[PDB]
Design a protein around this ligand. Structure first.
Ligand SMILES: O=S1(=O)CC(CNc2ncnc3[nH]ccc23)C1
Length: 167
């Protein structure tokens, strides 16, 4: 039993809710919140900008030190950093950004990072400003993640479309 509330069950291990991931993180304080990161961990907009703003820029400060030491992530890769006031840990995962021309096949690799964590609160990777089709992202999630994932979808209209079209 866990504290996630109001989710629709899609499969054995995937759950979905119309929610603001920032507000959901603030209330649940999950072990892991996933950030929709880029390779430079520059948290300017989308989910990343919102999560970072909620940490009063502490996520960005920590991220800049990470990059200065380790260099950029790979598209499809991830790193574990602090969850600050939102979660125990933040798993920064880089899905391909279609608006930069990155290969969508890397979306499966991106979701594979979730399998290293038993339970996660997450957005749909490569959705929103990353330019991928969220219906495809949900399909890849369901067919790749085997651990327990709670997906927060900010847009109510999109949420209803994802549920109604789910196979
Ligand atoms: O005030 S807001 O419209 C800003 C938004 C931030 N929270 C999100 N939650 C889940 N997926 C998301 N994708 C992009 C943002 C987002 C609530």
């Amino acid at each position: 039993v866990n504290s996630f509330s109001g989710y629709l069950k899609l499969t054995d291990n995937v759950y979905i809710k119309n929610a603001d991931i920032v507000e959901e993180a603030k209330k649940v304080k999950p072990t892991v919140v996933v950030n929709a990161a880029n390779v430079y961990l520059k948290h300017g907009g989308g989910v990343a900008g919102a999560l970072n703003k909620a940490t009063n820029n502490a996520m960005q400060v920590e991220s800049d030190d990470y990059i200065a030491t380790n260099g950029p992530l790979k598209v499809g890769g991830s790193c574990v950093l602090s969850g600050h006031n939102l979660a125990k840990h933040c798993l920064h995962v880089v899905g391909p950004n279609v608006n930069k021309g990155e290969d969508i096949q890397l979306l499966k690799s991106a979701y594979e990072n979730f399998n290293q964590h038993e339970v996660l609160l997450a957005p749909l990777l490569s959705a929103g400003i990353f330019g991928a089709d969220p219906i495809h992202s949900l399909r890849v999630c369901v067919d790749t993640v085997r651990t327990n994932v709670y997906l927060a979808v900010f847009d109510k209209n999109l949420y209803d479309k994802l549920v109604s079209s789910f196979l």
